Amino acid sequence: GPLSLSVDAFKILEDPKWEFPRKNLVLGKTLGEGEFGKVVKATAFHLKGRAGYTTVAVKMLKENASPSELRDLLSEFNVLKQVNHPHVIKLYGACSQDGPLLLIVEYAKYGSLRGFLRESRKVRALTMGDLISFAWQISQGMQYLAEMKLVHRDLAARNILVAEGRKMKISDFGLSRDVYEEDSYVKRSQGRIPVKWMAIESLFDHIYTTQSDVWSFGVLLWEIVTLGGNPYPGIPPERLFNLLKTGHRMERPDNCSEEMYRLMLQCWKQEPDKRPVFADISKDLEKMMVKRR
Amino acid sequence: GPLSLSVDAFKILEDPKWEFPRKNLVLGKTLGEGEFGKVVKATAFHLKGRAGYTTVAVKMLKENASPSELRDLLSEFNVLKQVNHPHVIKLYGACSQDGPLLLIVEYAKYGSLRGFLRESRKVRALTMGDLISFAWQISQGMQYLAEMKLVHRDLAARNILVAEGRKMKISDFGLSRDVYEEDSYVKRSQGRIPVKWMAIESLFDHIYTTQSDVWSFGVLLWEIVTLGGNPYPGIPPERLFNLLKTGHRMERPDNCSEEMYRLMLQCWKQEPDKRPVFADISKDLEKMMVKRR
Ligand SMILES: Nc1ncnc2c1ncn2[C@@H]1O[C@H](CO)[C@@H](O)[C@H]1O
Numbered sequence: 001g002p003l004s005l006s007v008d009a010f011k012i013l014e015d016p017k018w019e020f021p022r023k024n025l026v027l028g029k030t031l032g033e034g035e036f037g038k039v040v041k042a043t044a045f046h047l048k049g050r051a052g053y054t055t056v057a058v059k060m061l062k063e064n065a066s067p068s069e070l071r072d073l074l075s076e077f078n079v080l081k082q083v084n085h086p087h088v089i090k091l092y093g094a095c096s097q098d099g100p101l102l103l104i105v106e107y108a109k110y111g112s113l114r115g116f117l118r119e120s121r122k123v124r125a126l127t128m129g130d131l132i133s134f135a136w137q138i139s140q141g142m143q144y145l146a147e148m149k150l151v152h153r154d155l156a157a158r159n160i161l162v163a164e165g166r167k168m169k170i171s172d173f174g175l176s177r178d179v180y181e182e183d184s185y186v187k188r189s190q191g192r193i194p195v196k197w198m199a200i201e202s203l204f205d206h207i208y209t210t211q212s213d214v215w216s217f218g219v220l221l222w223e224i225v226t227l228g229g230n231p232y233p234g235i236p237p238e239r240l241f242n243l244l245k246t247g248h249r250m251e252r253p254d255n256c257s258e259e260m261y262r263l264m265l266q267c268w269k270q271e272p273d274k275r276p277v278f279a280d281i282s283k284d285l286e287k288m289m290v291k292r293r
Numbered sequence: 294g295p296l297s298l299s300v301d302a303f304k305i306l307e308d309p310k311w312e313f314p315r316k317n318l319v320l321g322k323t324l325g326e327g328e329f330g331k332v333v334k335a336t337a338f339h340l341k342g343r344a345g346y347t348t349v350a351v352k353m354l355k356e357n358a359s360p361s362e363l364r365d366l367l368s369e370f371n372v373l374k375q376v377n378h379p380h381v382i383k384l385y386g387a388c389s390q391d392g393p394l395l396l397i398v399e400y401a402k403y404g405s406l407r408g409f410l411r412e413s414r415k416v417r418a419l420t421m422g423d424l425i426s427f428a429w430q431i432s433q434g435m436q437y438l439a440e441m442k443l444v445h446r447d448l449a450a451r452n453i454l455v456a457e458g459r460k461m462k463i464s465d466f467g468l469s470r471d472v473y474e475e476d477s478y479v480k481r482s483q484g485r486i487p488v489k490w491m492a493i494e495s496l497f498d499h500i501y502t503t504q505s506d507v508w509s510f511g512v513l514l515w516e517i518v519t520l521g522g523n524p525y526p527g528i529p530p531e532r533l534f535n536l537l538k539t540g541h542r543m544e545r546p547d548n549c550s551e552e553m554y555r556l557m558l559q560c561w562k563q564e565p566d567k568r569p570v571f572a573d574i575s576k577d578l579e580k581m582m583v584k585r586r
């Protein structure tokens with residue numbers, strides 16, 4: 001089927017640009033379980049011309065992996081090899097021969113944005129300026145992907161990494177799709193994306209575009225302002241069908257300006273063409289930044 | 294889409310036979326995460342005519358549930374309401390109004406078969422007679438499902454429960470499908486079943502029938518004889534495409550008779566029509582049982 005064709009090609013085709021000697025990689029502790037497997041911390045000897053050891057993260061499958069998870073790991077490789085942006089996590093290499101498939105990616109010293117924020121306090125002291133900075137960085141990375149006609153489909157604070165210098169890195173591309181041809185991606189079966197982050201047309205009609213990524217960015221903006229809060233708090237996920245279709249949205253959270261909340265609401269308009277594009281969002285966030293000084 | 298139609302019907306249609314008052318249910322500790330959500334231990338007051346409290350298990354979604362997981366919870370309800378067999382876990386009720394969707398099911402005091410076996414020793418002392426008994430009980434439950442034209446699709450020791458009296462209960466029906474019409478179920482997208490338990494035609498061609506459940510039962514038979522061992526040990530899941538197609542199978546494990554291993558191999562024939570049916574499997578297991586006395 002499609003996956004056996006992909007697996008075989010991946011193993012057969014050995015892009016020297018990407019293949020890395022397993023004997024030069026040492027795996028350490030588990031950093032998490034992501035969308036399709038586990039991520040561990042690792043170190044890589046003489047990676048990409050760099051002398052000595054480089055600390056990296058490695059994405060791999062678990063023993064009980066399903067075909068869906070394997071597909072997602074290959075999808076993530078296929079996308080990450082094509083993109084390069086200061087706010088998108090970097091692919092360094094892969095191991096595809098003589099052992100389990102491993103992706104070698106940039107290590108983000110602070111982990112996920114949601115973890116980073118939940119460990120902080122609003123005044124780790126983070127100001128509203130810091131939060132707006134985080135959001136803007138993410139919007140920049142998404143402008144780039146959107147220009148590349150890539151839809152991420154799972155934008156959420158758990159899928160943003162926080163690197164050296166508190167720099168945002170969009171990550172977890174296993175579910176991301178190319179929409180160059182048709183400007184949308186449609187999935188006939190049910191999504192494997194949490195209900196509370198999907199745009200209304202994704203949830204009901206299974207349609208994904210850069211405008212549904214904008215809806216998810218609105219939910220991410222709410223996670224940022226609440227320092228890692230849980231969206232639609234106390235609302236069971238299955239109630240989101242009725243809640244969204246009858247025009248309800250999350251309320252303005254505590255320490256959130258009127259301007260920032262209006263931006264979330266515009267991201268959550270029912271009609272996708274009425275939502276901002278990422279270029280608009282970055283502009284809104286820049287303006288809030290300079291107004292605050 | 295299909296899921297919003299299902300959700301709405303489930304909430305709207307209130308089969309009095311199944312609906313249970315939330316105020317009569319008390320939830321306790323988490324027993325696990327299953328295929329689509331979490332299972333907790335609970336107690337239910339005046340359940341199904343029974344005086345007083347009854348200990349039960351409750352299946353529910355997590356806050357981050359995807360549409361796939363919600364679909365699977367509804368699928369499980371739809372199937373469990375139709376089946377009744379001493380080796381299939383029982384549905385007692387559901388809560389579908391004024392709060393999160395909850396399925397109320399029979400509590401199995403010993404948990405999963407895989408956990409039960411890994412806590413045991415071969416001589417908890419379990420004899421080969423006990424192990425064969427477990428396998429037979431499971432085969433009986435699968436004969437019944439197969440006669441009902443239901444394919445389970447995720448038969449594995451983690452999805453068998455061990456009740457009072459060490460009685461097997463097949464469980465986790467979220468992925469199970471009706472094949473009354475066509476005698477197969479085909480899934481166009483990738484499966485969410487661990488690669489190491491799927492039949493070769495399920496893995497490559499996405500075809501599921503009662504004969505692919507027979508293949509998975511062979512892997513379950515291997516888990517039983519190894520007291521909870523991990524299938525294809527040390528073999529990455531993505532290598533199973535090449536391994537199975539070139540005709541390789543698991544080796545005979547340590548404390549396993551020649552007859553029992555031949556039964557596993559017959560379950561794993563490449564051609565589904567050459568595998569035994571569950572009625573044959575039960576007969577093989579009964580004969581091994583009486584031969585041992
Ligand atoms: N590249 C990475 N660098 C650091 N931690 C990571 C990386 N990718 C994933 N993680 C961690 O693994 C978890 C699962 O995605 C994340 O929440 C984060 O904690």
Ligand SMILES: Nc1ncnc2c1ncn2[C@@H]1O[C@H](CO)[C@@H](O)[C@H]1O
Pocket residue numbers: 324325326327328332350382398399400401402404405408451454464
């Ligand atoms: N009906 C049940 N009774 C008892 N434990 C259960 C039940 N369903 C699931 N579990 C537990 O939850 C885990 C997840 O399925 C199982 O491994 C088992 O430990």
